[PDB]
Amino acid sequence: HHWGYGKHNGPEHWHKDFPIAKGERQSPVDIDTHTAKYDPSLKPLSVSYDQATSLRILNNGHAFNVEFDDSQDKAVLKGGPLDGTYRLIQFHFHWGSLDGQGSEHTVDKKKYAAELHLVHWNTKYGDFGKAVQQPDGLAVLGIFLKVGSAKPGLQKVVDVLDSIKTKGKSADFTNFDPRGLLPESLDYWTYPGSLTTPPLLECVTWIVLKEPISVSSEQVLKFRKLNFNGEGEPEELMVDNWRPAQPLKNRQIKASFK
Ligand SMILES: [Zn+2]
């Protein structure tokens, strides 16, 4: 049946429906900090999120997405390794059943409890659907979560999750400010990669921040109460919705910092 994260439809099966799964620039990857190359020509990231307009939160059956109005340049990413302007369309998380796993990227094989993806699309292609067909169509900002102190800016998200427990449920979610999810430093690693869920298209410039944010055990536990299934179907807890690291092959990871 349809792809997911279970024993019979999980990531090791995806290649049968999506051959790209075995492509040359698949994500995630392990970040080896000692062979990443410092690139002095990388510019600082420019995050302009002050005009962001969140609309809705949705359980799509494999994560929950917070969606933004992307019909104007209100929340944009630029700079770093990017050419041009990338509009924020949604963010989502990947997380584990235990605090020792959950991130998709790893750093010297270390796994984090969760990983936040802020997904942006290159405005020169007009809409998200065109952008995913281009090698420079998407920019995804990846932020690691470790378990520690609570993150106050995350609690608005945590409190609404009971309203979208099952697949297909959505809820109005206005006036959410993503600036509250960013770490203090914007130092990053970057490499060319793919979406980490089907259709696994190789259209992403990955920008992975060095500094994790901390969240409390109580906040991550509420992620684990969501459901893969629809209402009225047997209950399958939404945990371990992460793809394992893929071969780096002919790629260089660059770092903005030494
Ligand atoms: Zn993701």
PDB file of C-alpha atoms and ligand atoms in Angstrom:
ATOM      1  CA  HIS A   1       0.000   0.000   0.000  1.00  0.00           C
ATOM      2  CA  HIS A   2       1.051   3.775   0.336  1.00  0.00           C
ATOM      3  CA  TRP A   3       4.485   4.760   1.717  1.00  0.00           C
ATOM      4  CA  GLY A   4       5.019   5.443   5.453  1.00  0.00           C
ATOM      5  CA  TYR A   5       7.418   4.610   8.280  1.00  0.00           C
ATOM      6  CA  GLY A   6       6.281   1.099   9.267  1.00  0.00           C
ATOM      7  CA  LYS A   7       7.964  -2.331   8.808  1.00  0.00           C
ATOM      8  CA  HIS A   8       6.268  -3.010   5.460  1.00  0.00           C
ATOM      9  CA  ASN A   9       6.155   0.506   3.942  1.00  0.00           C
ATOM     10  CA  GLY A  10       9.098   2.330   5.543  1.00  0.00           C
ATOM     11  CA  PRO A  11      12.088   4.055   3.950  1.00  0.00           C
ATOM     12  CA  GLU A  12      13.802   0.835   2.838  1.00  0.00           C
ATOM     13  CA  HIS A  13      10.731   0.168   0.639  1.00  0.00           C
ATOM     14  CA  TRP A  14      10.306   3.628  -0.950  1.00  0.00           C
ATOM     15  CA  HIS A  15      12.578   2.914  -3.933  1.00  0.00           C
ATOM     16  CA  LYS A  16       9.992   0.523  -5.417  1.00  0.00           C
ATOM     17  CA  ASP A  17       7.518   3.382  -6.001  1.00  0.00           C
ATOM     18  CA  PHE A  18      10.109   6.196  -6.102  1.00  0.00           C
ATOM     19  CA  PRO A  19      13.331   5.031  -7.845  1.00  0.00           C
ATOM     20  CA  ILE A  20      15.018   8.432  -7.155  1.00  0.00           C
ATOM     21  CA  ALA A  21      15.374   7.110  -3.585  1.00  0.00           C
ATOM     22  CA  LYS A  22      18.598   5.506  -4.822  1.00  0.00           C
ATOM     23  CA  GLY A  23      19.734   8.733  -6.694  1.00  0.00           C
ATOM     24  CA  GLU A  24      22.980  10.677  -6.482  1.00  0.00           C
ATOM     25  CA  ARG A  25      21.905  13.603  -4.233  1.00  0.00           C
ATOM     26  CA  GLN A  26      19.518  12.069  -1.677  1.00  0.00           C
ATOM     27  CA  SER A  27      18.974  13.396   1.872  1.00  0.00           C
ATOM     28  CA  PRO A  28      19.498  13.210   4.786  1.00  0.00           C
ATOM     29  CA  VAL A  29      23.239  12.639   5.233  1.00  0.00           C
ATOM     30  CA  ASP A  30      25.630  12.378   8.133  1.00  0.00           C
ATOM     31  CA  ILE A  31      27.622  15.580   8.618  1.00  0.00           C
ATOM     32  CA  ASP A  32      31.275  14.679   9.241  1.00  0.00           C
ATOM     33  CA  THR A  33      32.517  17.861  10.915  1.00  0.00           C
ATOM     34  CA  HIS A  34      36.183  17.138  10.239  1.00  0.00           C
ATOM     35  CA  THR A  35      35.826  16.698   6.461  1.00  0.00           C
ATOM     36  CA  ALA A  36      33.353  19.544   5.918  1.00  0.00           C
ATOM     37  CA  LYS A  37      35.183  22.346   4.099  1.00  0.00           C
ATOM     38  CA  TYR A  38      35.187  25.887   5.447  1.00  0.00           C
ATOM     39  CA  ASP A  39      34.182  28.152   2.550  1.00  0.00           C
ATOM     40  CA  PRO A  40      35.131  31.804   3.204  1.00  0.00           C
ATOM     41  CA  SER A  41      33.032  32.942   0.231  1.00  0.00           C
ATOM     42  CA  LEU A  42      29.760  31.835   1.864  1.00  0.00           C
ATOM     43  CA  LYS A  43      27.768  34.867   2.957  1.00  0.00           C
ATOM     44  CA  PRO A  44      25.745  35.075   6.183  1.00  0.00           C
ATOM     45  CA  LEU A  45      22.171  33.877   6.089  1.00  0.00           C
ATOM     46  CA  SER A  46      19.489  36.555   5.887  1.00  0.00           C
ATOM     47  CA  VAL A  47      16.221  35.544   7.562  1.00  0.00           C
ATOM     48  CA  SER A  48      13.408  38.110   7.226  1.00  0.00           C
ATOM     49  CA  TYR A  49      10.455  36.626   9.102  1.00  0.00           C
ATOM     50  CA  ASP A  50       8.984  39.781  10.678  1.00  0.00           C
ATOM     51  CA  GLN A  51       6.031  39.891   8.236  1.00  0.00           C
ATOM     52  CA  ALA A  52       5.280  36.139   8.312  1.00  0.00           C
ATOM     53  CA  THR A  53       1.587  35.215   8.096  1.00  0.00           C
ATOM     54  CA  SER A  54       0.784  31.714   9.419  1.00  0.00           C
ATOM     55  CA  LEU A  55      -2.626  30.345   8.260  1.00  0.00           C
ATOM     56  CA  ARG A  56      -3.177  26.756   9.372  1.00  0.00           C
ATOM     57  CA  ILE A  57      -1.746  23.662  11.083  1.00  0.00           C
ATOM     58  CA  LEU A  58      -2.457  20.300   9.424  1.00  0.00           C
ATOM     59  CA  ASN A  59      -1.861  16.619  10.185  1.00  0.00           C
ATOM     60  CA  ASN A  60      -1.067  15.121   6.777  1.00  0.00           C
ATOM     61  CA  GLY A  61      -0.542  11.555   7.976  1.00  0.00           C
ATOM     62  CA  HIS A  62       3.257  11.671   8.178  1.00  0.00           C
ATOM     63  CA  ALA A  63       3.938  14.878  10.142  1.00  0.00           C
ATOM     64  CA  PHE A  64       2.184  18.109  11.010  1.00  0.00           C
ATOM     65  CA  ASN A  65       2.788  21.184   8.838  1.00  0.00           C
ATOM     66  CA  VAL A  66       2.331  24.806   9.852  1.00  0.00           C
ATOM     67  CA  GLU A  67       1.452  26.631   6.608  1.00  0.00           C
ATOM     68  CA  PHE A  68       2.151  30.249   5.676  1.00  0.00           C
ATOM     69  CA  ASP A  69       0.795  32.711   3.129  1.00  0.00           C
ATOM     70  CA  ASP A  70       3.378  32.577   0.317  1.00  0.00           C
ATOM     71  CA  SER A  71       1.542  34.789  -2.202  1.00  0.00           C
ATOM     72  CA  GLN A  72       3.877  37.713  -1.397  1.00  0.00           C
ATOM     73  CA  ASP A  73       7.465  38.204  -0.175  1.00  0.00           C
ATOM     74  CA  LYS A  74       6.538  38.361   3.502  1.00  0.00           C
ATOM     75  CA  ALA A  75       8.792  35.676   5.034  1.00  0.00           C
ATOM     76  CA  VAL A  76      11.927  35.186   2.950  1.00  0.00           C
ATOM     77  CA  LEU A  77      15.338  33.573   3.135  1.00  0.00           C
ATOM     78  CA  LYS A  78      18.280  34.900   1.188  1.00  0.00           C
ATOM     79  CA  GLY A  79      22.025  35.042   1.322  1.00  0.00           C
ATOM     80  CA  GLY A  80      24.084  32.107   2.473  1.00  0.00           C
ATOM     81  CA  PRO A  81      24.741  29.861  -0.529  1.00  0.00           C
ATOM     82  CA  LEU A  82      21.541  31.042  -2.219  1.00  0.00           C
ATOM     83  CA  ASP A  83      20.969  33.127  -5.330  1.00  0.00           C
ATOM     84  CA  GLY A  84      17.712  35.010  -5.247  1.00  0.00           C
ATOM     85  CA  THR A  85      14.764  35.071  -2.842  1.00  0.00           C
ATOM     86  CA  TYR A  86      13.126  31.989  -1.285  1.00  0.00           C
ATOM     87  CA  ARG A  87       9.597  32.283   0.253  1.00  0.00           C
ATOM     88  CA  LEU A  88       8.646  30.318   3.413  1.00  0.00           C
ATOM     89  CA  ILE A  89       5.672  27.986   2.633  1.00  0.00           C
ATOM     90  CA  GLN A  90       5.563  25.589   5.627  1.00  0.00           C
ATOM     91  CA  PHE A  91       7.508  24.081   8.506  1.00  0.00           C
ATOM     92  CA  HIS A  92       7.297  20.625  10.063  1.00  0.00           C
ATOM     93  CA  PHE A  93       9.237  18.313  12.375  1.00  0.00           C
ATOM     94  CA  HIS A  94      10.642  14.779  12.426  1.00  0.00           C
ATOM     95  CA  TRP A  95      10.958  13.082  15.814  1.00  0.00           C
ATOM     96  CA  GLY A  96      11.611   9.762  17.519  1.00  0.00           C
ATOM     97  CA  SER A  97       9.945   7.352  19.914  1.00  0.00           C
ATOM     98  CA  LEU A  98      12.845   7.978  22.342  1.00  0.00           C
ATOM     99  CA  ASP A  99      14.991  11.015  23.106  1.00  0.00           C
ATOM    100  CA  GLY A 100      18.041   9.317  21.527  1.00  0.00           C
ATOM    101  CA  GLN A 101      16.689   9.408  17.978  1.00  0.00           C
ATOM    102  CA  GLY A 102      14.449  11.474  15.794  1.00  0.00           C
ATOM    103  CA  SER A 103      16.623  13.781  13.692  1.00  0.00           C
ATOM    104  CA  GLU A 104      17.191  13.010  10.015  1.00  0.00           C
ATOM    105  CA  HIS A 105      20.608  14.601   9.643  1.00  0.00           C
ATOM    106  CA  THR A 106      23.289  13.455  12.060  1.00  0.00           C
ATOM    107  CA  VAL A 107      26.466  15.231  13.182  1.00  0.00           C
ATOM    108  CA  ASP A 108      29.465  12.881  13.453  1.00  0.00           C
ATOM    109  CA  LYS A 109      26.834  10.087  13.710  1.00  0.00           C
ATOM    110  CA  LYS A 110      25.110  11.809  16.668  1.00  0.00           C
ATOM    111  CA  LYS A 111      21.289  11.771  16.495  1.00  0.00           C
ATOM    112  CA  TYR A 112      19.124  14.497  18.031  1.00  0.00           C
ATOM    113  CA  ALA A 113      15.646  14.142  19.523  1.00  0.00           C
ATOM    114  CA  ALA A 114      13.981  15.928  16.614  1.00  0.00           C
ATOM    115  CA  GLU A 115      14.627  18.043  13.539  1.00  0.00           C
ATOM    116  CA  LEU A 116      12.736  21.134  12.363  1.00  0.00           C
ATOM    117  CA  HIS A 117      12.485  21.837   8.604  1.00  0.00           C
ATOM    118  CA  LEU A 118      11.540  25.325   7.377  1.00  0.00           C
ATOM    119  CA  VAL A 119      10.738  24.851   3.677  1.00  0.00           C
ATOM    120  CA  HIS A 120      11.213  27.731   1.190  1.00  0.00           C
ATOM    121  CA  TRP A 121      10.817  27.949  -2.597  1.00  0.00           C
ATOM    122  CA  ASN A 122      12.675  30.037  -5.178  1.00  0.00           C
ATOM    123  CA  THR A 123      10.409  32.880  -6.288  1.00  0.00           C
ATOM    124  CA  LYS A 124      11.796  32.871  -9.807  1.00  0.00           C
ATOM    125  CA  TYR A 125       9.731  29.712 -10.521  1.00  0.00           C
ATOM    126  CA  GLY A 126       6.379  31.284  -9.649  1.00  0.00           C
ATOM    127  CA  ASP A 127       4.939  28.591  -7.368  1.00  0.00           C
ATOM    128  CA  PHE A 128       5.995  25.702  -5.159  1.00  0.00           C
ATOM    129  CA  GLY A 129       4.851  23.091  -7.699  1.00  0.00           C
ATOM    130  CA  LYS A 130       7.175  24.429 -10.408  1.00  0.00           C
ATOM    131  CA  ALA A 131      10.078  24.935  -7.985  1.00  0.00           C
ATOM    132  CA  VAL A 132      10.271  21.259  -6.958  1.00  0.00           C
ATOM    133  CA  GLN A 133      11.083  20.376 -10.581  1.00  0.00           C
ATOM    134  CA  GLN A 134      14.265  22.482 -10.525  1.00  0.00           C
ATOM    135  CA  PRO A 135      17.709  21.698  -9.054  1.00  0.00           C
ATOM    136  CA  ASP A 136      17.735  25.038  -7.190  1.00  0.00           C
ATOM    137  CA  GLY A 137      14.009  25.143  -6.499  1.00  0.00           C
ATOM    138  CA  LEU A 138      13.907  24.707  -2.701  1.00  0.00           C
ATOM    139  CA  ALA A 139      15.898  25.849   0.301  1.00  0.00           C
ATOM    140  CA  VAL A 140      15.281  23.982   3.558  1.00  0.00           C
ATOM    141  CA  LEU A 141      16.582  25.309   6.856  1.00  0.00           C
ATOM    142  CA  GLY A 142      17.225  22.432   9.259  1.00  0.00           C
ATOM    143  CA  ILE A 143      17.362  22.950  13.026  1.00  0.00           C
ATOM    144  CA  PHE A 144      18.189  20.252  15.572  1.00  0.00           C
ATOM    145  CA  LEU A 145      16.196  19.869  18.800  1.00  0.00           C
ATOM    146  CA  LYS A 146      17.808  18.513  21.969  1.00  0.00           C
ATOM    147  CA  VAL A 147      15.941  17.741  25.186  1.00  0.00           C
ATOM    148  CA  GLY A 148      16.663  20.254  27.928  1.00  0.00           C
ATOM    149  CA  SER A 149      14.926  23.466  28.927  1.00  0.00           C
ATOM    150  CA  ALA A 150      11.597  24.348  27.371  1.00  0.00           C
ATOM    151  CA  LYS A 151      11.404  26.566  24.314  1.00  0.00           C
ATOM    152  CA  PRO A 152       8.656  29.131  25.024  1.00  0.00           C
ATOM    153  CA  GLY A 153       8.169  29.992  21.339  1.00  0.00           C
ATOM    154  CA  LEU A 154       7.234  26.359  20.640  1.00  0.00           C
ATOM    155  CA  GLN A 155       4.420  26.077  23.183  1.00  0.00           C
ATOM    156  CA  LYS A 156       1.749  27.648  20.912  1.00  0.00           C
ATOM    157  CA  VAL A 157       2.360  24.722  18.518  1.00  0.00           C
ATOM    158  CA  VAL A 158       2.348  22.114  21.278  1.00  0.00           C
ATOM    159  CA  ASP A 159      -0.962  23.309  22.717  1.00  0.00           C
ATOM    160  CA  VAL A 160      -2.909  22.905  19.459  1.00  0.00           C
ATOM    161  CA  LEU A 161      -1.784  19.355  18.655  1.00  0.00           C
ATOM    162  CA  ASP A 162      -4.788  17.781  20.394  1.00  0.00           C
ATOM    163  CA  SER A 163      -6.999  19.499  17.800  1.00  0.00           C
ATOM    164  CA  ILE A 164      -5.230  17.743  14.866  1.00  0.00           C
ATOM    165  CA  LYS A 165      -4.542  14.299  16.373  1.00  0.00           C
ATOM    166  CA  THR A 166      -5.499  12.262  13.295  1.00  0.00           C
ATOM    167  CA  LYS A 167      -4.675  12.309   9.582  1.00  0.00           C
ATOM    168  CA  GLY A 168      -6.532  14.965   7.606  1.00  0.00           C
ATOM    169  CA  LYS A 169      -7.452  17.183  10.572  1.00  0.00           C
ATOM    170  CA  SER A 170      -6.581  20.875  10.272  1.00  0.00           C
ATOM    171  CA  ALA A 171      -6.992  23.933  12.458  1.00  0.00           C
ATOM    172  CA  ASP A 172      -6.736  27.686  12.004  1.00  0.00           C
ATOM    173  CA  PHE A 173      -3.314  28.797  13.219  1.00  0.00           C
ATOM    174  CA  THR A 174      -2.791  32.536  12.801  1.00  0.00           C
ATOM    175  CA  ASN A 175      -0.220  35.002  14.222  1.00  0.00           C
ATOM    176  CA  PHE A 176       2.493  32.375  14.834  1.00  0.00           C
ATOM    177  CA  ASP A 177       5.987  33.923  14.660  1.00  0.00           C
ATOM    178  CA  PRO A 178       8.690  31.481  13.449  1.00  0.00           C
ATOM    179  CA  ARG A 179      11.474  33.792  14.712  1.00  0.00           C
ATOM    180  CA  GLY A 180      10.785  32.088  18.156  1.00  0.00           C
ATOM    181  CA  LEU A 181      12.215  28.780  16.823  1.00  0.00           C
ATOM    182  CA  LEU A 182      15.660  30.072  15.754  1.00  0.00           C
ATOM    183  CA  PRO A 183      18.881  29.516  17.716  1.00  0.00           C
ATOM    184  CA  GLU A 184      21.140  32.407  18.704  1.00  0.00           C
ATOM    185  CA  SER A 185      23.786  31.703  16.044  1.00  0.00           C
ATOM    186  CA  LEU A 186      23.133  31.209  12.319  1.00  0.00           C
ATOM    187  CA  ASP A 187      26.384  29.372  11.478  1.00  0.00           C
ATOM    188  CA  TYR A 188      25.550  26.530   9.119  1.00  0.00           C
ATOM    189  CA  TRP A 189      26.576  23.638   6.920  1.00  0.00           C
ATOM    190  CA  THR A 190      25.249  23.422   3.375  1.00  0.00           C
ATOM    191  CA  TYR A 191      25.050  20.731   0.706  1.00  0.00           C
ATOM    192  CA  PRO A 192      22.813  19.907  -2.296  1.00  0.00           C
ATOM    193  CA  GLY A 193      20.194  17.249  -1.535  1.00  0.00           C
ATOM    194  CA  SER A 194      16.570  16.174  -1.809  1.00  0.00           C
ATOM    195  CA  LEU A 195      13.236  16.119  -0.072  1.00  0.00           C
ATOM    196  CA  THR A 196      13.371  13.486   2.653  1.00  0.00           C
ATOM    197  CA  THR A 197       9.846  12.229   1.949  1.00  0.00           C
ATOM    198  CA  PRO A 198       8.389  10.964  -1.327  1.00  0.00           C
ATOM    199  CA  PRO A 199       8.540  12.080  -4.063  1.00  0.00           C
ATOM    200  CA  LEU A 200      12.194  12.556  -2.885  1.00  0.00           C
ATOM    201  CA  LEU A 201      12.910  15.128  -5.604  1.00  0.00           C
ATOM    202  CA  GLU A 202      16.483  16.385  -5.852  1.00  0.00           C
ATOM    203  CA  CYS A 203      15.637  20.071  -5.705  1.00  0.00           C
ATOM    204  CA  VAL A 204      16.887  21.183  -2.247  1.00  0.00           C
ATOM    205  CA  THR A 205      19.760  23.348  -1.078  1.00  0.00           C
ATOM    206  CA  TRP A 206      20.075  22.171   2.523  1.00  0.00           C
ATOM    207  CA  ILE A 207      21.130  24.705   5.165  1.00  0.00           C
ATOM    208  CA  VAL A 208      21.692  22.920   8.490  1.00  0.00           C
ATOM    209  CA  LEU A 209      22.317  25.092  11.543  1.00  0.00           C
ATOM    210  CA  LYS A 210      25.191  24.135  13.847  1.00  0.00           C
ATOM    211  CA  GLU A 211      23.464  25.241  17.055  1.00  0.00           C
ATOM    212  CA  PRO A 212      20.499  23.156  18.286  1.00  0.00           C
ATOM    213  CA  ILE A 213      17.533  24.603  20.127  1.00  0.00           C
ATOM    214  CA  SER A 214      16.472  23.029  23.408  1.00  0.00           C
ATOM    215  CA  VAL A 215      12.943  21.810  24.143  1.00  0.00           C
ATOM    216  CA  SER A 216      11.592  20.178  27.276  1.00  0.00           C
ATOM    217  CA  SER A 217      10.804  16.501  27.632  1.00  0.00           C
ATOM    218  CA  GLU A 218       7.135  17.495  28.097  1.00  0.00           C
ATOM    219  CA  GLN A 219       7.069  19.365  24.779  1.00  0.00           C
ATOM    220  CA  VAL A 220       8.482  16.439  22.739  1.00  0.00           C
ATOM    221  CA  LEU A 221       6.225  13.954  24.505  1.00  0.00           C
ATOM    222  CA  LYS A 222       3.204  15.795  23.130  1.00  0.00           C
ATOM    223  CA  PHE A 223       4.536  15.296  19.559  1.00  0.00           C
ATOM    224  CA  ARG A 224       4.433  11.533  20.231  1.00  0.00           C
ATOM    225  CA  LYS A 225       0.688  11.606  20.987  1.00  0.00           C
ATOM    226  CA  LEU A 226      -0.242  12.314  17.364  1.00  0.00           C
ATOM    227  CA  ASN A 227      -1.579   9.601  15.049  1.00  0.00           C
ATOM    228  CA  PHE A 228      -0.518   8.365  11.599  1.00  0.00           C
ATOM    229  CA  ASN A 229      -4.046   7.041  11.090  1.00  0.00           C
ATOM    230  CA  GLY A 230      -7.313   8.763  10.301  1.00  0.00           C
ATOM    231  CA  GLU A 231     -10.138   9.092  12.796  1.00  0.00           C
ATOM    232  CA  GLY A 232     -12.031   5.840  13.309  1.00  0.00           C
ATOM    233  CA  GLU A 233      -9.065   3.742  12.127  1.00  0.00           C
ATOM    234  CA  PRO A 234      -6.849   1.694  14.470  1.00  0.00           C
ATOM    235  CA  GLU A 235      -4.464   3.877  16.447  1.00  0.00           C
ATOM    236  CA  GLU A 236      -0.854   4.119  15.210  1.00  0.00           C
ATOM    237  CA  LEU A 237       1.224   6.634  17.146  1.00  0.00           C
ATOM    238  CA  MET A 238       3.148   9.125  14.984  1.00  0.00           C
ATOM    239  CA  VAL A 239       6.742   8.422  16.083  1.00  0.00           C
ATOM    240  CA  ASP A 240      10.027   7.779  14.262  1.00  0.00           C
ATOM    241  CA  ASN A 241       8.934   9.626  11.123  1.00  0.00           C
ATOM    242  CA  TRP A 242      12.553  10.109  10.019  1.00  0.00           C
ATOM    243  CA  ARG A 243      14.505   8.748   7.071  1.00  0.00           C
ATOM    244  CA  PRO A 244      17.961   7.285   7.790  1.00  0.00           C
ATOM    245  CA  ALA A 245      21.119   8.892   6.460  1.00  0.00           C
ATOM    246  CA  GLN A 246      21.885   8.310   2.783  1.00  0.00           C
ATOM    247  CA  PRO A 247      25.282   7.968   1.021  1.00  0.00           C
ATOM    248  CA  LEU A 248      27.078  11.244   0.379  1.00  0.00           C
ATOM    249  CA  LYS A 249      28.446   9.986  -2.997  1.00  0.00           C
ATOM    250  CA  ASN A 250      29.981  12.810  -5.100  1.00  0.00           C
ATOM    251  CA  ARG A 251      29.111  15.692  -2.746  1.00  0.00           C
ATOM    252  CA  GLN A 252      31.006  18.159  -0.567  1.00  0.00           C
ATOM    253  CA  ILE A 253      29.520  19.591   2.618  1.00  0.00           C
ATOM    254  CA  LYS A 254      30.599  23.197   3.133  1.00  0.00           C
ATOM    255  CA  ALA A 255      30.673  25.074   6.425  1.00  0.00           C
ATOM    256  CA  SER A 256      30.168  28.815   7.017  1.00  0.00           C
ATOM    257  CA  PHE A 257      32.434  28.741  10.076  1.00  0.00           C
ATOM    258  CA  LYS A 258      35.717  27.399  11.345  1.00  0.00           C
TER     259      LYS A 258
HETATM  260 ZN    ZN B   1      11.217  17.323   6.701  1.00  0.00          ZN
END
